[PDB]
Structure formats: C-alpha cells, structure tokens
Design a binder for this molecule. Structure first.
Ligand SMILES: [Ca+2]
Length: 554
C-alpha cells in the first residue's frame, strides 16, 4: 500500500485571510473550525495551515517570538486544541508550518543572544564583525538591503536572509538543534499529522561567509541553498524527531537547483517525504522577483516533466499552482478576463488534480478567485514590496509607477485578500474592517453562489476530487507527456496496473484539434469542462473548445 499522503488532496489555509469571527478584520481559529464542513464537503483530506504561533507579525506569522504558544490574533491553545478535535471528528488531518530557518527578533533567545558577546545564547544566531568599514560580506536580504544588521551593543552584525526582524538561527550550534527538536516534539505530541518546513534548504550557512561572486549575486537565493551541512542536519532531525512519530514531512525547497532535490526526498535518505519545488511557479519570474517574463505551454510542460523525473522511483512531489507567496493561479497560468476566467480555472483544476504527486489547493482557487486590482503602492501590506521600494525606488533604479505596474502582477498580496464567502459586506469574511481589502469581484465570485451551482468552478473541483479519490492511477500512476514540444494543447497519460487515463487540456482561447497517439483510442469520458459533447467510444482524436479540459479512459 502507498502511504495515505500519496493519495490525499490537501487544502492550504492562510488563517489570517480565511474567516474572522470577532470583527477585528483578521481570520482566526474559530473561523476555520466553523468552516470545516465546507472543506469536508469539497472532499479535502488534510489542511496545511500557515504559521499559527506567537508572532509580532512583521511577516504575518513567519517571525515567531515563542514556538510553544499560539498567535494572539488566531485564539488560544484551547482554540487550537478544538480545531484539532473537530478535524479528527471528520477524519481529516492537520499539517502545520514549521519556521526554523529564523525566529523573531522578539524571541527570548534573540533578546538574550544580542545582549553581550559572552552569553549562553550568543551562538543561537550568527554574529560577525564587519569588513573594510561595512558589512561582513555582500549578502543581500530577500526583503531589502543587506542580510547583515549591525547591533551597536556589541558592534557586530547579525545575519537575516529575510527581514531585519527575522534573525537566522544557527544550526551549527548543537544546543540550538536540540532546542528545535524539543519544540517539534511539543507539537507532534499533540497529534499533528504533518509538518511543512519553510525555506528548508537555507539551514546550513557557508563557513567563513565569503562574498558572493557577481554571478551568485544575481541569483543569491541559489547560493543560500549550498551550505555544506544541510543534509547532515535534515538527517539528524529525522533520526531524533520524525522517526518517533507518524507525521508526514514536506520541504519548501526554495532556490535549490532542481538536480539536488532528490537529496531531500529520496525515501532511502531518511530526510523529508515530499517536496514543494518552485521551478514551475517561478518559471516566468525574472531574477529580481518582481518582473514577469513571457513563457509558453511548452516551457510549462517541460518544467513539469523535469520535476516529475527528479522524484523518480523513491521520491515524491507535491503539486500546486498557487500559495500564499505567489499570484493567483487563474491570473498567473490561466486567463482571468471575465469571459475566460471560469473556463481557464476549470482547465487548471483538471491539471492540478491529475498530476503525479500530492495536490495542494490554495484557499479560494476552488472559486476561481483572481489577482487584486491594486491602484497605489499603499494598497500593499507585504514587506517584500516595501523591500523592492527600498532596493529599487529609493536607489533611483526604478520609478514608483514602474514598481507598481510590475508588482501588481507578482506580489504575494494577490493571494492574501480575504476569502470570498458570499455577497454580504466584506464578502462575509468579517463584520469589521478587513486587514487587507476584499476584491470587488466578490459580487460575482463567492462560495455561497458557487456551491449552489452544478456548473460552477467549485462544483468542478468537487467532481474532480471524487474522480481522483476513485481512480488510483490518477494519484500514484506513472506520468508521460505525449508531446513536450506542443505549445497549444497539454496532453499526458496516467497509468497503473494496466489501466491508462488520458488528460487533454487546451491552453488556447481558440478551438484546437488533438490526435491521440497511433493505436490509442478513447474508451470512456470521465469528465470534461467547457465541452458541448463527449467523444464517441473508439475516437482517435478530439475537437477542443477554447480552454476545454478532459479526463478519458483509454
Ligand atoms: Ca478575528
């Protein structure tokens, strides 16, 4: 038998933006608990929640000031316990986010570490002398300026790959590793079923902190994944923690070269169970992370083919088209214009739910939610956009208007607007003022209207999820791309135990034809979207409407 997580469908909840129950404009645990029936009815097996720990929220939960306490905005430990109990009543599982590349600068470890050079917490973090009058080296931060921040108390700099208020934890220090392992056991003893490791590839730092070369500077995210002790630390964590439990582990392998991914997920290596990779989701992103570079379906499918190959026999991939760090799937990979939004969102649901891997549906994608119409830079909450303002606008590299036009397409805030529950005030998300503005298209895109309509995006996701659950080949079967060079129609097979299925997805807003491989014929149509008629049993070809998708037994 294959482990449960290989055939599960996960849903990602960004709790801040899912459901508010107390008018403060921020989503909370009670809100999520009240919506479990909605997720159960969609067919979700497991939920991954973004970080839910005590946090000053300079990066919305990813700056944690106490790993053993819940975030004040989300509720109390009792609320979290109640969430767990209600998930369990429904046979559902919880995956939590684990953020141990860095902590908050408000964490008591860091308050102590920074206080002097000779204290027991000094080497919980990285403290270094500046060089030639400036920073220890030329490392940049993802969130703006240098990755090194001076502390006048000791006159040394501390390292922060992310924000200034997210100092990196020092995995080279054994006592620090032991603290992290104990903290993980604290949550696993509560029964959590999965853990997702934020920026898991950056834990090991390079000895001596030499300068990056000019080449490396342009792709610094990759350099940060090349620490010599990385796999040693991941293997130790598995031996001391995950060997004692029955939880699934998944790594956000951001910035690593694709050919190193098997090191994290080959089951023989006893590291992680599954990979989140970013080759596909960043396939059309410029190196600066805020421009977009036009790509075609041939690029999209060739990337998938490569990622599939690296899982091979002993590894396992997740599959996702959206998360809390990226623009909305239908806007990014589909066509979000009024006339094409529903058809292309369905086509993308078909893709997501028929890939070899564990699919993750990002909250609101089952409604066909879109990017937000930002008008000014003040419409963004996101600290990454403030950092681009700092690195590009303040330095005269770009104008504010150039930053705005381009980041409107790429910003994480596109994924973070409140979930659209119905057409009441604030889309039923809150009775107060939402922390981030609700998209005005909530009058046309909302759960209440979608659930009631058999022809909706929600209904199609629901139907695909049943089909996947009922068809073993569609989770664990082999994957074969019929024609990796085709830039119009995406077609592939899934097969297991002598049964083969064909998936065919038109990525053009125009009619297209499709010819099956010589010798292959349609046996049955499981489901189609935007199609006037199923093919005839025995068909050797298909006539596709704009954005038509389908699954066929062959
Ligand atoms: Ca609230």
């Amino acid at each position: 038998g294959a482990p449960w997580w290989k055939s599960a469908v996960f849903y990602q909840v960004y709790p801040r933006s899912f459901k508010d129950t107390n008018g403060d404009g921020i989503g909370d645990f009670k809100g999520l608990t009240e919506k479990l029936d909605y997720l159960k009815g969609l067919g979700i097996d497991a939920i991954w929640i973004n970080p839910h720990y005590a946090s000053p929220n300079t990066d919305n939960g990813y700056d944690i000031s106490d790993y053993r306490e819940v975030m004040k905005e989300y509720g109390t430990m009792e609320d979290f316990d109640r969430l767990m109990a209600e998930l369990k009543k429904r046979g559902m599982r919880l995956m939590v986010d684990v953020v141990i590349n860095h902590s908050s600068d408000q964490h008591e470890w860091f308050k102590s570490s920074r206080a002097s050079k000779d204290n027991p917490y000094r080497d919980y973090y990285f403290w270094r002398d500046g060089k030639d009058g400036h920073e220890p080296n030329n490392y940049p931060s993802f969130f703006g300026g240098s990755a090194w921040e001076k502390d006048p108390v000791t006159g040394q700099y501390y390292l922060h790959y992310l924000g200034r208020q997210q100092p990196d934890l020092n995995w080279d220090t054994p006592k620090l590793r032991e603290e992290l392992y104990a903290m993980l056991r604290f949550w696993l003893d509560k029964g959590v079923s999965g853990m997702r490791f934020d920026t898991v590839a950056t834990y090991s730092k390079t000895p001596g902190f030499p300068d990056l070369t000019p080449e490396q500077m342009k792709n610094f995210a990759e350099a940060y994944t090349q620490g010599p002790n990385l796999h040693r630390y991941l293997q130790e964590m598995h031996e001391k923690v995950f060997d004692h439990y029955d939880a699934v582990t998944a790594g956000e392998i951001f910035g690593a070269p694709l050919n190193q991914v098997p090191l994290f997920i080959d089951s023989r290596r006893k590291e992680l169970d599954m990979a989140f990779t970013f080759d596909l989701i960043r396939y059309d992103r410029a190196l600066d992370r805020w421009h977009t570079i036009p790509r075609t379906l041939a690029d999209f499918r060739q990337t998938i083919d490569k990622v599939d190959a690296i899982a091979g026999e002993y590894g396992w991939n997740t599959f996702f088209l959206g998360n809390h760090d990226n623009p909305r799937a239908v806007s990014h990979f589909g066509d979000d214009r009024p006339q094409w939004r529903e058809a292309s969102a369905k086509a993308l649901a078909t893709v997501t739910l028929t890939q070899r891997g564990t699919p993750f549906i990002f909250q609101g994608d089952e409604l066909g939610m879109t990017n937000y119409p930002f008008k000014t830079l003040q419409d963004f909450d996101d600290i990454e956009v403030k950092g681009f303002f700092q690195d590009y606008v303040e330095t005269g590299k770009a104008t504010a208007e150039e930053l705005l036009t381009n980041v409107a397409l790429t910003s994480r805030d596109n994924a973070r607007t409140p979930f659209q529950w119905d057409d009441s005030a604030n889309a039923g998300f809150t009775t107060g003022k939402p922390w981030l503005k609700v998209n005005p298209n909530y009058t046309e895109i909302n759960a209440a209207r979608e659930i009631g309509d058999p022809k909706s995006v929600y209904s199609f996701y629901r139907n695909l999820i049943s089909i996947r659950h009922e068809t073993p080949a569609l989770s664990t079967g082999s994957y074969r791309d019929i024609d990796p060079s085709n830039a119009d129609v995406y077609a592939y097979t899934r097969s297991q135990d002598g049964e083969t299925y064909l998936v065919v997805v038109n990525f053009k807003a125009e009619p297209r034809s499709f010819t099956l491989p010589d010798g292959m014929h349609i046996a049955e149509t499981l489901i189609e979207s935007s199609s006037p008629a199923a093919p005839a049993a025995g068909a050797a070809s298909l006539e596709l409407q704009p954005w038509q998708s389908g699954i066929y037994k062959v």
